[PDB]
Amino acid sequence: AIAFEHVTYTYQAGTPMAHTALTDVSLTVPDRGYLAIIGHTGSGKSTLIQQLNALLKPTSGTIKIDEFTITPETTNAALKPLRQHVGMVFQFPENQLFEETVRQDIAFGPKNFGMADADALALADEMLTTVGLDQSYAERSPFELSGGQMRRVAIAGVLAMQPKVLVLDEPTAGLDPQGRQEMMRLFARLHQEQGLTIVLVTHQMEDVAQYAEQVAVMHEGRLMKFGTPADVFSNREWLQDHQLDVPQAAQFARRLRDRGLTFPKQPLTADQLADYLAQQWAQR
Amino acid sequence: HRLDPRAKLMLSFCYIIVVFLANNIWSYAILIAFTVGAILSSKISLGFFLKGIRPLLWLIVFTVVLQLLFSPAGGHTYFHWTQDGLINAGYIFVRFLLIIMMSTLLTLSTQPLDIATGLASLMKPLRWVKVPVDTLAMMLSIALRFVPTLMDEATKIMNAQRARGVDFGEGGLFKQAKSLIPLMVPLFMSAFNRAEDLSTAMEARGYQDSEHRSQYRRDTVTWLLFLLGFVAILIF
Amino acid sequence: ENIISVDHLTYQYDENQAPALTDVSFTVHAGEWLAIVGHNGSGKSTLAKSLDGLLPFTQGSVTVGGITLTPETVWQVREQIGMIFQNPDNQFVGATVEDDVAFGLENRQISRDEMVPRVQAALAQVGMTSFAQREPSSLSGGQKQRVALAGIVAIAPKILILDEATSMLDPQGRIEMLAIVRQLRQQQNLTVISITHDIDEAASADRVLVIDDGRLVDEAVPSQIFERGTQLVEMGLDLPFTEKLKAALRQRGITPPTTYQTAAEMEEWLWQSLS
Amino acid sequence: RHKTFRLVVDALLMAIVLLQNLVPFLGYIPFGPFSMTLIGLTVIVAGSALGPRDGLLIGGFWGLITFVRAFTWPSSPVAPLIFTNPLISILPRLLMGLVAGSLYLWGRHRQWSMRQAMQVAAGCAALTNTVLVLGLVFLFYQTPAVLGYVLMISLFTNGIPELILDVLVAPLIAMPLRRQWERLKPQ
């Protein structure tokens, strides 16, 4: 589990310029969780994503992640084993490849935390499948590759560190509709099977309403709402005010509410809607 | 009044070649007058400039000690006979201070692309010698705009690298350089791939040759003040 | 109006790598909005590249509004073609918005007297006039693209090619760029060609061209493509919501209309169906 | 087309260098009185990824910066003594992007591998950079025309920061370049 307890972070703290990107953030995520963090750009949803990895320590408040606890006085040297427990996929992760073969780049994660090359390349072998690719790719150069498959290798190299929490800033950005899809499912499958905590920063409400069990609405550095997607999406004006919106299943749901149909919950995805219309259809 | 275009460079080019000449004291009393005379107009705070100068003086001293230290020591444990260091170190420190002041006065009253278009128009001559000065202007104008973009993308690669498990700064000198590959390789490749995507874009735009540049692109009285105060100085 | 006939571009070997193209032919009318969807490695990438001088094909010929693309007829085809690329930086020249918008002209021999007011005009056409004094870094992907467009409006051509110009853009940012092309289309009768995986961009087109493994493989009005249902994602386009809904209904026993419905049409159908 | 592409790549290696100056973490890596640069290993690249034409340009762009740096914003404290005469600062940078370029061309013509040529052309361009500074320092040690012990001291504190820079580029320098000319070669 992840727990923020009054976490606030100010850049250049103790300085006149100082900027407070993240203020008074308390949130809990259970084990096997799926948090989506949404909100306007530069509302500190990413200042807050870097907290988890331990790329920034809180300025005040505490964070607890399983065995781990980060406080402002935590020294970054007793935090190194957190960089593997929490695996962080950065946006456009393709610009992080650098090794000669793609197998050495994947195995690169693991080795940095101890693994001898023998079993790290062995791990790198098995990691390639997981992500999508064929064994041919193992020996190839990272740059021989397609933009889309460079990202698979990027991602897979992170999965190789065997993390218990998986943080992706923008997994599907700049990808074709199918690519976006192979991957959203890859991630759901890992969470669904093999039990993993996903943290997802998106601007795509559909991914959220369809995959998340927990949403955080970040606005201007504060935690405006937190709770289930049902909670968070059920009021729309409020969302607009924080420059967001409900997903499309819900707007269309309104159209049908406008026409005299009543739903027992506000439908957030097409499946859940179709689930209502079906039962209603039987009643017809 | 930083609203001075080009000359400001040629100024500080020429302000530099003045500081060495000044051997007298009745002479370069004239210097501080126009030196602080320049600073006073730009701002009255007088604090940031001194503060924003401190980091550098640790260096200038670090040098000036070397000048003085060697002569007395003689690289021989000769102690302090060090007169030359006292006058020669003193001159250095004095010199490499009036410059910094005025170069720092320049950088604080001049947006960096205003220099680049200045620098690359103080070579508005410089053609008629086979130098494609205008093309170099281009690559300069470009180099400039990518400096922030490359800097973002650099820390971005770095943090991403850290997540993987790379220790930047830790150790030395080998383990410290060895950690620089996983940032260097991508930084360059991104810049290569960056420039391939960029050149292509330029071709789509109607540019095929550097030779035709258009668009973009009071001051004398300062040079009057740097003439009726300069030539009126190498007297002493 | 422009004409592609019997076009082929391989790397000279096989079908893979930079997406091949084999025997591609179509023509655009004037003031049409043609969208070109396709998966990956359908040459839809390189097909964009090819309608400008930037791709050296061996077989086939391109002709744009009269002139046909040849090494010494390139600059006279490019003149009437405004292209906007996938990445918002990397097509940004100069530190400042207004130097970029001008870059089109300044290195096309126009004089600062005619150039100054055509640029403030161009910038204002895309609603970007306040950002004139700005570094590209301080701009979002959204904006950086709007000034790329201001760059093409400043030179004002007849063809606007949008090579997945919304690909890397936030949805709010993407929505603006699209609306200011629609906004553009109404005035000046601009001709738009779009390569995208975006349903919204593809639905705003008059006619859609589907590429599959390097070969032009279908062509229709957008309502016809969308009846591909879930096969759309695989095809190279996301799903219109109504097709999401129809899919999720088949899964739950309900057989809906085949022809593509709109929200308005589908909402109405459900009410009529559900008494 | 190719020429235009080259114009931009230079301009971007030109930005990487501005970037290494602006950000000290990238420019160098302390010793601690001394410090080995990394701005060196970027020109070894520009020389042997594009050719000597660019190794000239990027190597010149450097030596020109360490020039204005020496006055306005010193690099080292040992910079206001040496790199204030633009022969001594400029010449090594300019002429080591040259050895960089050709010694890859030359050694490829000798039918070496792309690895072996890179390595060689780096440990050389380092050398044929450090030597010039010792060269040009030894020269201006002994004449005025406008401190021999001081000059000797200056010479001493180059025969070390650069001695590492030589072991730097030969392994490390090669890796961020073999990939590079590879992409360039296909184009």
PDB file of N, CA and C in Angstrom, chain B residues 90-148:
ATOM      1  N   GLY B  90      47.697  41.703  -7.465  1.00  0.00           N
ATOM      2  CA  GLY B  90      46.815  42.838  -7.259  1.00  0.00           C
ATOM      3  C   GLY B  90      46.259  43.403  -8.548  1.00  0.00           C
ATOM      4  N   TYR B  91      47.106  43.513  -9.564  1.00  0.00           N
ATOM      5  CA  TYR B  91      46.666  43.970 -10.875  1.00  0.00           C
ATOM      6  C   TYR B  91      45.659  42.998 -11.457  1.00  0.00           C
ATOM      7  N   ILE B  92      45.965  41.703 -11.364  1.00  0.00           N
ATOM      8  CA  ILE B  92      45.116  40.650 -11.914  1.00  0.00           C
ATOM      9  C   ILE B  92      43.743  40.774 -11.327  1.00  0.00           C
ATOM     10  N   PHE B  93      43.700  40.701 -10.006  1.00  0.00           N
ATOM     11  CA  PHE B  93      42.449  40.727  -9.296  1.00  0.00           C
ATOM     12  C   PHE B  93      41.662  41.973  -9.692  1.00  0.00           C
ATOM     13  N   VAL B  94      42.341  43.114  -9.738  1.00  0.00           N
ATOM     14  CA  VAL B  94      41.713  44.359 -10.164  1.00  0.00           C
ATOM     15  C   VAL B  94      41.163  44.241 -11.577  1.00  0.00           C
ATOM     16  N   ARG B  95      41.987  43.745 -12.490  1.00  0.00           N
ATOM     17  CA  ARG B  95      41.569  43.568 -13.873  1.00  0.00           C
ATOM     18  C   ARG B  95      40.410  42.569 -14.000  1.00  0.00           C
ATOM     19  N   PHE B  96      40.630  41.329 -13.586  1.00  0.00           N
ATOM     20  CA  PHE B  96      39.585  40.327 -13.711  1.00  0.00           C
ATOM     21  C   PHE B  96      38.468  40.541 -12.703  1.00  0.00           C
ATOM     22  N   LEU B  97      38.024  41.789 -12.598  1.00  0.00           N
ATOM     23  CA  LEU B  97      36.933  42.164 -11.718  1.00  0.00           C
ATOM     24  C   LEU B  97      36.137  43.252 -12.410  1.00  0.00           C
ATOM     25  N   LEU B  98      36.849  44.202 -12.998  1.00  0.00           N
ATOM     26  CA  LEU B  98      36.208  45.259 -13.762  1.00  0.00           C
ATOM     27  C   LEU B  98      35.606  44.662 -15.026  1.00  0.00           C
ATOM     28  N   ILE B  99      36.206  43.572 -15.494  1.00  0.00           N
ATOM     29  CA  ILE B  99      35.692  42.875 -16.656  1.00  0.00           C
ATOM     30  C   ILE B  99      34.412  42.160 -16.284  1.00  0.00           C
ATOM     31  N   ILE B 100      34.513  41.286 -15.283  1.00  0.00           N
ATOM     32  CA  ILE B 100      33.377  40.503 -14.813  1.00  0.00           C
ATOM     33  C   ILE B 100      32.197  41.399 -14.509  1.00  0.00           C
ATOM     34  N   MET B 101      32.433  42.446 -13.730  1.00  0.00           N
ATOM     35  CA  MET B 101      31.417  43.456 -13.477  1.00  0.00           C
ATOM     36  C   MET B 101      30.709  43.865 -14.771  1.00  0.00           C
ATOM     37  N   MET B 102      31.483  44.254 -15.774  1.00  0.00           N
ATOM     38  CA  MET B 102      30.922  44.813 -16.999  1.00  0.00           C
ATOM     39  C   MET B 102      30.373  43.740 -17.947  1.00  0.00           C
ATOM     40  N   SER B 103      30.870  42.518 -17.831  1.00  0.00           N
ATOM     41  CA  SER B 103      30.338  41.444 -18.652  1.00  0.00           C
ATOM     42  C   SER B 103      29.027  40.985 -18.037  1.00  0.00           C
ATOM     43  N   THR B 104      28.983  41.065 -16.715  1.00  0.00           N
ATOM     44  CA  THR B 104      27.815  40.699 -15.935  1.00  0.00           C
ATOM     45  C   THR B 104      26.787  41.826 -15.998  1.00  0.00           C
ATOM     46  N   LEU B 105      27.259  43.037 -16.257  1.00  0.00           N
ATOM     47  CA  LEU B 105      26.352  44.145 -16.483  1.00  0.00           C
ATOM     48  C   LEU B 105      25.731  43.944 -17.849  1.00  0.00           C
ATOM     49  N   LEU B 106      26.489  43.341 -18.762  1.00  0.00           N
ATOM     50  CA  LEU B 106      26.007  43.108 -20.123  1.00  0.00           C
ATOM     51  C   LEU B 106      24.950  42.031 -20.134  1.00  0.00           C
ATOM     52  N   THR B 107      25.280  40.889 -19.544  1.00  0.00           N
ATOM     53  CA  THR B 107      24.383  39.745 -19.533  1.00  0.00           C
ATOM     54  C   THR B 107      23.052  39.988 -18.798  1.00  0.00           C
ATOM     55  N   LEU B 108      23.014  41.006 -17.940  1.00  0.00           N
ATOM     56  CA  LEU B 108      21.839  41.336 -17.136  1.00  0.00           C
ATOM     57  C   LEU B 108      20.991  42.464 -17.723  1.00  0.00           C
ATOM     58  N   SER B 109      21.360  42.937 -18.902  1.00  0.00           N
ATOM     59  CA  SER B 109      20.629  44.019 -19.537  1.00  0.00           C
ATOM     60  C   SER B 109      20.498  43.680 -21.007  1.00  0.00           C
ATOM     61  N   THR B 110      20.649  42.396 -21.310  1.00  0.00           N
ATOM     62  CA  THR B 110      20.606  41.931 -22.688  1.00  0.00           C
ATOM     63  C   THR B 110      20.146  40.469 -22.787  1.00  0.00           C
ATOM     64  N   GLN B 111      18.944  40.295 -23.311  1.00  0.00           N
ATOM     65  CA  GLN B 111      18.398  38.986 -23.605  1.00  0.00           C
ATOM     66  C   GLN B 111      19.351  38.275 -24.574  1.00  0.00           C
ATOM     67  N   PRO B 112      19.614  36.976 -24.329  1.00  0.00           N
ATOM     68  CA  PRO B 112      20.631  36.211 -25.062  1.00  0.00           C
ATOM     69  C   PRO B 112      20.453  36.139 -26.579  1.00  0.00           C
ATOM     70  N   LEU B 113      19.230  36.180 -27.096  1.00  0.00           N
ATOM     71  CA  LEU B 113      19.069  36.140 -28.554  1.00  0.00           C
ATOM     72  C   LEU B 113      19.310  37.518 -29.178  1.00  0.00           C
ATOM     73  N   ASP B 114      19.285  38.555 -28.343  1.00  0.00           N
ATOM     74  CA  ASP B 114      19.639  39.898 -28.784  1.00  0.00           C
ATOM     75  C   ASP B 114      21.140  40.009 -28.993  1.00  0.00           C
ATOM     76  N   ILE B 115      21.899  39.198 -28.262  1.00  0.00           N
ATOM     77  CA  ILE B 115      23.333  39.083 -28.513  1.00  0.00           C
ATOM     78  C   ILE B 115      23.577  38.344 -29.815  1.00  0.00           C
ATOM     79  N   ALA B 116      22.935  37.188 -29.951  1.00  0.00           N
ATOM     80  CA  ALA B 116      23.178  36.298 -31.074  1.00  0.00           C
ATOM     81  C   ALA B 116      22.920  36.995 -32.404  1.00  0.00           C
ATOM     82  N   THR B 117      21.943  37.893 -32.407  1.00  0.00           N
ATOM     83  CA  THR B 117      21.645  38.673 -33.596  1.00  0.00           C
ATOM     84  C   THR B 117      22.556  39.905 -33.679  1.00  0.00           C
ATOM     85  N   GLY B 118      23.069  40.332 -32.530  1.00  0.00           N
ATOM     86  CA  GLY B 118      24.108  41.342 -32.486  1.00  0.00           C
ATOM     87  C   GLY B 118      25.403  40.748 -33.004  1.00  0.00           C
ATOM     88  N   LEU B 119      25.957  39.790 -32.259  1.00  0.00           N
ATOM     89  CA  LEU B 119      27.173  39.070 -32.653  1.00  0.00           C
ATOM     90  C   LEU B 119      27.178  38.719 -34.129  1.00  0.00           C
ATOM     91  N   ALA B 120      26.060  38.182 -34.605  1.00  0.00           N
ATOM     92  CA  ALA B 120      25.921  37.830 -36.012  1.00  0.00           C
ATOM     93  C   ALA B 120      25.355  38.999 -36.823  1.00  0.00           C
ATOM     94  N   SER B 121      25.817  40.201 -36.500  1.00  0.00           N
ATOM     95  CA  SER B 121      25.577  41.390 -37.308  1.00  0.00           C
ATOM     96  C   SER B 121      26.659  42.405 -36.961  1.00  0.00           C
ATOM     97  N   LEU B 122      27.553  42.005 -36.057  1.00  0.00           N
ATOM     98  CA  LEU B 122      28.814  42.697 -35.855  1.00  0.00           C
ATOM     99  C   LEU B 122      29.788  42.007 -36.768  1.00  0.00           C
ATOM    100  N   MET B 123      29.266  41.039 -37.502  1.00  0.00           N
ATOM    101  CA  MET B 123      30.012  40.385 -38.550  1.00  0.00           C
ATOM    102  C   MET B 123      29.219  40.599 -39.830  1.00  0.00           C
ATOM    103  N   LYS B 124      28.325  41.584 -39.762  1.00  0.00           N
ATOM    104  CA  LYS B 124      27.675  42.157 -40.935  1.00  0.00           C
ATOM    105  C   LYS B 124      28.716  42.623 -41.963  1.00  0.00           C
ATOM    106  N   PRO B 125      29.901  43.084 -41.503  1.00  0.00           N
ATOM    107  CA  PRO B 125      31.044  42.977 -42.417  1.00  0.00           C
ATOM    108  C   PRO B 125      31.368  41.501 -42.679  1.00  0.00           C
ATOM    109  N   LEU B 126      32.595  41.084 -42.383  1.00  0.00           N
ATOM    110  CA  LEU B 126      32.975  39.658 -42.330  1.00  0.00           C
ATOM    111  C   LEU B 126      32.618  38.738 -43.525  1.00  0.00           C
ATOM    112  N   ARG B 127      31.643  39.134 -44.337  1.00  0.00           N
ATOM    113  CA  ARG B 127      31.455  38.521 -45.644  1.00  0.00           C
ATOM    114  C   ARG B 127      32.618  39.027 -46.472  1.00  0.00           C
ATOM    115  N   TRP B 128      32.684  38.621 -47.734  1.00  0.00           N
ATOM    116  CA  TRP B 128      33.809  39.003 -48.581  1.00  0.00           C
ATOM    117  C   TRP B 128      35.104  38.552 -47.916  1.00  0.00           C
ATOM    118  N   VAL B 129      35.115  37.290 -47.501  1.00  0.00           N
ATOM    119  CA  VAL B 129      36.308  36.626 -46.990  1.00  0.00           C
ATOM    120  C   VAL B 129      36.044  35.123 -46.994  1.00  0.00           C
ATOM    121  N   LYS B 130      34.983  34.740 -47.708  1.00  0.00           N
ATOM    122  CA  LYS B 130      34.548  33.350 -47.899  1.00  0.00           C
ATOM    123  C   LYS B 130      33.803  32.728 -46.711  1.00  0.00           C
ATOM    124  N   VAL B 131      33.759  33.435 -45.584  1.00  0.00           N
ATOM    125  CA  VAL B 131      33.009  32.966 -44.420  1.00  0.00           C
ATOM    126  C   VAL B 131      31.511  33.100 -44.676  1.00  0.00           C
ATOM    127  N   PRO B 132      30.763  31.980 -44.601  1.00  0.00           N
ATOM    128  CA  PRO B 132      29.303  32.123 -44.693  1.00  0.00           C
ATOM    129  C   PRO B 132      28.732  32.543 -43.337  1.00  0.00           C
ATOM    130  N   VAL B 133      28.958  33.803 -42.983  1.00  0.00           N
ATOM    131  CA  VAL B 133      28.587  34.331 -41.676  1.00  0.00           C
ATOM    132  C   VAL B 133      27.083  34.230 -41.414  1.00  0.00           C
ATOM    133  N   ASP B 134      26.286  34.337 -42.470  1.00  0.00           N
ATOM    134  CA  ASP B 134      24.829  34.238 -42.358  1.00  0.00           C
ATOM    135  C   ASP B 134      24.330  32.815 -42.032  1.00  0.00           C
ATOM    136  N   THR B 135      25.019  31.815 -42.564  1.00  0.00           N
ATOM    137  CA  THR B 135      24.722  30.425 -42.258  1.00  0.00           C
ATOM    138  C   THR B 135      25.059  30.129 -40.808  1.00  0.00           C
ATOM    139  N   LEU B 136      26.250  30.541 -40.388  1.00  0.00           N
ATOM    140  CA  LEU B 136      26.640  30.476 -38.983  1.00  0.00           C
ATOM    141  C   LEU B 136      25.663  31.221 -38.076  1.00  0.00           C
ATOM    142  N   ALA B 137      25.051  32.290 -38.578  1.00  0.00           N
ATOM    143  CA  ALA B 137      23.996  32.977 -37.838  1.00  0.00           C
ATOM    144  C   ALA B 137      22.843  32.017 -37.610  1.00  0.00           C
ATOM    145  N   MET B 138      22.385  31.392 -38.692  1.00  0.00           N
ATOM    146  CA  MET B 138      21.359  30.350 -38.620  1.00  0.00           C
ATOM    147  C   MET B 138      21.642  29.292 -37.543  1.00  0.00           C
ATOM    148  N   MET B 139      22.751  28.568 -37.704  1.00  0.00           N
ATOM    149  CA  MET B 139      23.133  27.534 -36.749  1.00  0.00           C
ATOM    150  C   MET B 139      23.282  28.088 -35.355  1.00  0.00           C
ATOM    151  N   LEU B 140      23.517  29.387 -35.244  1.00  0.00           N
ATOM    152  CA  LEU B 140      23.557  30.004 -33.940  1.00  0.00           C
ATOM    153  C   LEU B 140      22.132  30.187 -33.461  1.00  0.00           C
ATOM    154  N   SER B 141      21.340  30.939 -34.215  1.00  0.00           N
ATOM    155  CA  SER B 141      19.924  31.110 -33.912  1.00  0.00           C
ATOM    156  C   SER B 141      19.237  29.786 -33.543  1.00  0.00           C
ATOM    157  N   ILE B 142      19.598  28.700 -34.222  1.00  0.00           N
ATOM    158  CA  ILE B 142      19.051  27.386 -33.885  1.00  0.00           C
ATOM    159  C   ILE B 142      19.625  26.837 -32.586  1.00  0.00           C
ATOM    160  N   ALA B 143      20.946  26.731 -32.514  1.00  0.00           N
ATOM    161  CA  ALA B 143      21.620  26.291 -31.302  1.00  0.00           C
ATOM    162  C   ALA B 143      20.980  26.897 -30.067  1.00  0.00           C
ATOM    163  N   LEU B 144      20.602  28.164 -30.167  1.00  0.00           N
ATOM    164  CA  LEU B 144      20.066  28.888 -29.031  1.00  0.00           C
ATOM    165  C   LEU B 144      18.735  28.351 -28.573  1.00  0.00           C
ATOM    166  N   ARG B 145      17.830  28.120 -29.511  1.00  0.00           N
ATOM    167  CA  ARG B 145      16.478  27.717 -29.148  1.00  0.00           C
ATOM    168  C   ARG B 145      16.409  26.287 -28.598  1.00  0.00           C
ATOM    169  N   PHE B 146      17.392  25.476 -28.950  1.00  0.00           N
ATOM    170  CA  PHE B 146      17.408  24.111 -28.482  1.00  0.00           C
ATOM    171  C   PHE B 146      18.089  23.976 -27.140  1.00  0.00           C
ATOM    172  N   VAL B 147      18.764  25.026 -26.699  1.00  0.00           N
ATOM    173  CA  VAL B 147      19.480  24.909 -25.443  1.00  0.00           C
ATOM    174  C   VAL B 147      18.534  24.580 -24.283  1.00  0.00           C
ATOM    175  N   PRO B 148      17.436  25.347 -24.103  1.00  0.00           N
ATOM    176  CA  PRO B 148      16.433  24.922 -23.108  1.00  0.00           C
ATOM    177  C   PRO B 148      15.765  23.557 -23.372  1.00  0.00           C
TER     178      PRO B 148
END
